[PDB]
């Protein structure tokens, strides 16, 4: 008489591709408290869907055709199109909510909207800003996935999104995930430059991008002392897919993909869960709060002010 | 057939040269008297030069090389004549003619065998002159010059003066600046040059090259240590040629890795009596890479361990020994001690740990195969090795 | 390989030779070997740039006699090399000072880009990933209008030049052709399909944003209508020399970019020019083939350039500042 409610096999659609709410996740929610919400953000081919799938209910040794979050297929890469649309939803058995996100400012959505405001160009930017603000106001942590280092345009977008957010202020933690890392990026000399650039580029961001999720203490660098870094921000690197002398494998210079994925998952799960509103909330209450926030963000006033400026 | 080749030569003397060259080579006295026409033509053109005759000279050189390749006292005379006619045209400075001449000289020199006393001063000065002015050259001229140098070194064995290699491995030498090319072919030919130089049977001419290489490695290591805010070391293998020089972090790492890879020529030999033994150099001289350099520059440590493992695995880890036998009577103990000390550490990388474990497994499996290696289980290095494996 | 400012001040061997100007710009990731340097070395087939070698903008110039072509490389805050130095300087030496600093850097980069967009024959934009940022569409939209407010001032300084007639009117030799270069970055014949899809997407996006028009005169740049203008550099072991050396050690212990560029260079070198107009009524496009001294006579005057600062201050962080 204490069996679990149900087990989710595949992620559902929390928000339709037309920016419409979809109330269909209450069937898998309970009345428990102390819930954790994780969101993702990134460009078109960064790999947010794969990261979310591997961090929620998947393993690297499994296949990409059975992932909880649909990933880009080989036939789709040749056409230069996107796969994830709208916002997804999935909750693991540990009562951890995972939220996916479509690419921001991606040319695929723009091209699809061409054959369908003053011009059909600021619409994509506003949709991206709306999603960023929503994830920044109803999620406990947000992970930013970057295909390459220093895009120089994501920081400005993040600051602008946080400046136009809906609303003793609450600022969720920010995580910088560098996907498809190489050996050259796994050196202390380059690490210092990376941390310095990240810290100097977000000096007045008001977000919690430091003091938590320190990969230096996760045994990634055995002999690297903590004082070697002026300010270790929350940055993590994810590498590319992976008689006796002649059988020695090649030298990669970076830890195994599975090891880093497991470490990242453990660190994400062992994170804090601060309060969102000025009251305690449960799973159902959190769902209702998120729905109300999305409804308010859609018919907001700051967005119109920013729209007349473009 | 005597007159049939004339039409082919005339047609080829005008991207399709490969087809005619292959056909002529596969088609097959008269050649002895036929080469005289080309020799006289080149001599006349060179004399009249002292500028549109360059394409003709290049075509003649290419056809001459093809006809000679299609196939013993006039070889030196013809080689000297070709070298003089090529060096005479030192005004136009055309890369095509130089490349063709280099290929022709290379094939002509390779036709004979290293069992004579041909004139080497002219060839040495020609190669040095071409190398001293081959910095901002094309991708093919550099490869041709390096190939010619390798062929010259291989052809002249035990007769090359010490001055030849003394001025070839110095900072002012352009050879050291040619290995920085992005193309893999240039790096491959450079490594081939290093291998040919280190594959000499003359100890006095090889000792200077070995010392120069060691000095360069020491200079790069010292530069890295200084840039990492640490005192210098390895002062027992320093050289005067590299007393004061500056190497960047990336440049120093690249130089160290290149030298370590080049040392495999003598490290992987199949049986070289030098003062600093390769085993001692990679096991006792370069002991600072595991203290602090293994954290910021693990590539150097991995390369050193890889070359040491490759050199030790070819001699059965020196088990039978535990002249050559007496000199290697204390190699297994050192290997075991090094493995134990490295494994007992807690600041090792994944690749380094995997390599060390593979080496340890190979050594262990090796230990019990013999029934004659039983006394080797009482020495302390074995206990340290077991402790490292357990920890 | 010398600075542009140090080249205009100073020729007899090539005083009058027909050449083509090729501008190189775009973003670059944090790496030892930059994409622009490798591109120049591969195109010239020689080690032009040796390996291991207030404002944050730089313009480098290099002449190639074997091909009679001039290359103009642009470096700004977009590249990680300059961004790292800027951050390091800012670390040692307020929410209002940083904003002004970034705004000034962006304005300087925009001015340099505008200068390159009027003294180049063919220009190419690089990128570290296959996907192209749509933000560029806005940058160009904010650049064209800028030249419209600076064109009357530029033609006044080059009035006494032997460039010609069309050059003095359009302040450019001919409508420059823009090329796009991307990198595989581990993605994925599929390459041809990906290139075609990218070209179609770029053309549609640029046409919708009104950046590209039927007339090849009003627009600041055009793209070919029947040839290829998008190239994807495949992965190779050239990058990270340490890895290549390790691979070599392990082994011992046990179209094309050039053609892609000449396809367009042969047109300008043959005086034919460019013709891109399918608006049901094409019109002739101005084109000129100046020499070394002839090109420098105008390049120096354009580089030396009162009212430019005032016009550039009216044009991005401006939206964010206004909203705040
Ligand atoms: N670390 C990685 N190593 C190798 N391949 C990867 C890596 N991350 C992602 N990929 C592959 O590259 C592509 C990235 O797309 P993916 O499905 O992971 O999500 P995405 O790029 O966020 O998608 P969307 O276009 O919806 O934003 C996929 O084909 C995936 O298999
Ligand atoms: Mg996706």
UniProtKB/Swiss-Prot annotation, chain A:
UniProt keywords, alphabetically: Acetylation, Intellectual disability, Nonsense-mediated mRNA decay, Phosphoprotein
Associated disease: Heart and brain malformation syndrome: An autosomal recessive syndrome characterized by multiple congenital anomalies such as cardiac defects, brain malformations, including cerebellar vermis hypoplasia, hypoplastic corpus callosum and Dandy-Walker malformation, profoundly delayed psychomotor development, microphthalmia, and facial dysmorphism. Neurodevelopmental disorder with intention tremor, pyramidal signs, dyspraxia, and ocular anomalies: An autosomal recessive disorder characterized by characterized by mild to moderate intellectual disability, dysmorphic facial features, intention tremor, dyspraxia, and vertical strabismus.
UniProt entry tagged with the keyword Oxidoreductase: no
Free-text description of this protein's post-translational modifications in UniProt: Phosphorylated by SMG1.
One annotated GO molecular function: identical protein binding
Function: Involved in nonsense-mediated decay (NMD) of mRNAs containing premature stop codons. Is recruited by release factors to stalled ribosomes together with SMG1 and SMG8 (forming the SMG1C protein kinase complex) and, in the SMG1C complex, is required for the efficient association between SMG1 and SMG8. Plays a role in brain, heart, and eye development.
Organism superkingdom: Eukaryota
GO terms, biological process: brain development; eye development; heart development; in utero embryonic development; negative regulation of apoptotic process; nuclear-transcribed mRNA catabolic process, nonsense-mediated decay
Protein name: Nonsense-mediated mRNA decay factor SMG9
Subunit structure and binding partners: Self-associates to form homodimers and forms heterodimers with SMG8; these assembly forms may represent SMG1C intermediate forms. Component of the SMG1C complex composed of SMG1, SMG8 and SMG9. Interacts with DHX34; the interaction is RNA-independent.
GO cellular component, as recorded: cytosol
UniProt similarity note: Belongs to the SMG9 family.
UniProtKB/Swiss-Prot annotation, chain B:
Modification comment: Autophosphorylated.
Source superkingdom: Eukaryota
Subcellular location: Nucleus; Cytoplasm
Tissue: Widely expressed, with highest level in heart and skeletal muscle. Expressed in placenta, brain, lung and spleen, but not in liver.
More info: This gene is located in a region of chromosome 16 that contains 2 segmental duplications. Other genes that are highly related to this exist, but they probably represent pseudogenes.
Similarity field: Belongs to the PI3/PI4-kinase family.
Role this protein plays: Serine/threonine protein kinase involved in both mRNA surveillance and genotoxic stress response pathways. Recognizes the substrate consensus sequence [ST]-Q. Plays a central role in nonsense-mediated decay (NMD) of mRNAs containing premature stop codons by phosphorylating UPF1/RENT1. Recruited by release factors to stalled ribosomes together with SMG8 and SMG9 (forming the SMG1C protein kinase complex), and UPF1 to form the transient SURF (SMG1-UPF1-eRF1-eRF3) complex.
Quaternary structure note: Component of the SMG1C complex composed of SMG1, SMG8 and SMG9; the recruitment of SMG8 to SMG1 N-terminus induces a large conformational change in the SMG1 C-terminal head domain containing the catalytic domain. Component of the transient SURF (SMG1-UPF1-eRF1-eRF3) complex. Part of a complex composed of SMG1, DHX34 and UPF1; within the complex DHX34 acts as a scaffolding protein to facilitate SMG1 phosphorylation of UPF1. Interacts with PRKCI. Interacts with TELO2 and TTI1. Interacts with RUVBL1 and RUVBL2. Interacts with UPF2.
The protein, known as: Serine/threonine-protein kinase SMG1
Swiss-Prot record, chain C:
Transmembrane annotation, as ranges: none
Modification after translation, per record: Phosphorylated by SMG1.
Assembly behavior: Component of the SMG1C complex composed of SMG1, SMG8 and SMG9; the recruitment of SMG8 to SMG1 N-terminus induces a large conformational change in the SMG1 C-terminal head domain containing the catalytic domain. Forms heterodimers with SMG9; this assembly form may represent a SMG1C intermediate form.
Family of the protein in this entry: Belongs to the SMG8 family.
Function in brief: Involved in nonsense-mediated decay (NMD) of mRNAs containing premature stop codons. Is recruited by release factors to stalled ribosomes together with SMG1 and SMG9 (forming the SMG1C protein kinase complex) and, in the SMG1C complex, is required to mediate the recruitment of SMG1 to the ribosome:SURF complex and to suppress SMG1 kinase activity until the ribosome:SURF complex locates the exon junction complex (EJC). Acts as a regulator of kinase activity.
Disorder cited: Alzahrani-Kuwahara syndrome: An autosomal recessive disorder characterized by severe global developmental delay, impaired intellectual function, poor or absent speech, microcephaly, and facial dysmorphism. Additional variable features include early-onset cataracts, hypotonia, lower limb spasticity, and congenital heart malformations.
Protein name listed in UniProt: Nonsense-mediated mRNA decay factor SMG8
Protein source organism: Homo sapiens (Human)
Residue span relative to the full protein: 4 to 496 of 991
